[PDB]
Design a protein around this ligand. Structure first.
Ligand SMILES: N=CCNC(=O)C1(NC(=O)c2ccc(N)c(F)c2)CCCCC1
Length: 215
C-alpha cells in the first residue's frame, strides 16, 4: 500500500453534508463509501441519498442510529439506491419511498475490516477507496477540533457512537493520520474534515467497525 493516499484528490469524494439533529451518521457514512465506489467504477461522482437509507433500511433505527453493513446489505437486496436529488434529505424518518426510476448506484455486497486492525484498514483504503468507519466522537476535544492530528488520551475505543468516512491516510509533522470526512457540515472541524491519529492504539476505535461496499 502507498505510504499516503487522499481520495479527495482523485475526485472520489462529494461535498461535506450536514446531518442535522437526526442520528443518521451511519447513512451519510454509507453513502460516502458508495459514492467513492461509484466514482471508481463509472468515472462519475454524484451525491447519493442518505434519506433513502434512513427510511428503508428496516434492520436499522432511522434517526435513532444504525449500522453501515446493514445499509450496504439493503442496497444490494434492493437492487439500487437513489441519488440525493431523487430522494432528498429531510432530517426525520418516514415510510420507505424509494423510487427505482431515481436509481444512481448498485451494491454487490460488502466486506468488514478485521476488528481493531488499523493495518488492515489502511490496506483496504489503499485497495478500495473510502471506507466507512465508526468512532467515539463524544469528547468535547473531538467536537472542537480545528487543526492538526487529533489525539485525546481519553477517547474510548469501546464507546463507538458516531460513523464517519475514511477518505485517505498519511502523516503530518511525523504523526500518522487518517483523513476523515464528517457529516456535521463545512462549518465544523477543518472544512468538515478531521485528521485522526493512526496506529495510536486504535485511537477512538477507528478500526473497530469499519466496512466498505462492493460494486
Ligand atoms: N449520527 C450517528 C449516530 N451513531 C450511530 O448511528 C452508530 N450506531 C448506532 O448508534 C446504532 C446502531 C444500531 C441500532 N439499532 C441503533 F439503535 C443505534 C453508533 C455506533 C457505531 C455505528 C453508528
Amino acid at each position: 500500500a502507498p505510504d499516503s493516499v487522499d481520495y479527495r484528490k482523485k475526485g472520489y469524494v462529494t461535498p461535506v453534508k450536514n446531518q442535522g439533529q437526526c442520528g443518521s451518521c451511519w447513512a451519510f457514512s454509507s453513502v460516502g463509501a458508495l459514492e467513492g465506489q461509484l466514482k471508481k467504477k463509472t468515472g462519475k461522482l454524484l451525491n447519493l441519498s442518505p434519506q433513502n437509507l434512513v427510511d428503508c433500511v428496516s434492520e436499522n433505527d432511522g434517526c435513532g442510529g444504525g449500522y453501515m453493513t446493514n445499509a450496504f446489505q439493503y442496497v444490494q437486496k434492493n437492487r439500487g439506491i437513489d441519488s440525493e436529488d431523487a430522494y432528498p434529505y429531510v432530517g426525520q424518518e418516514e415510510s420507505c419511498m424509494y423510487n427505482p426510476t431515481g436509481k444512481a448506484a448498485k451494491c454487490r455486497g460488502y466486506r468488514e475490516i478485521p476488528e481493531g486492525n488499523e493495518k488492515a484498514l489502511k490496506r483496504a483504503v489503499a485497495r478500495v477507496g473510502p471506507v466507512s468507519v465508526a468512532i467515539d466522537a463524544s469528547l468535547t476535544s473531538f467536537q472542537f477540533y480545528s487543526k492538526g492530528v487529533y489525539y485525546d488520551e481519553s477517547c474510548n475505543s469501546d464507546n463507538l457512537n458516531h460513523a464517519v468516512l475514511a477518505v485517505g491516510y498519511g502523516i503530518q509533522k511525523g504523526n500518522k493520520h487518517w483523513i476523515i470526512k464528517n457529516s456535521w457540515g463545512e462549518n465544523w472541524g477543518n472544512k468538515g474534515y478531521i485528521l485522526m491519529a493512526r496506529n495510536k492504539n486504535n485511537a477512538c476505535g477507528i478500526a473497530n467497525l469499519a466496512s466498505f461496499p462492493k460494486m
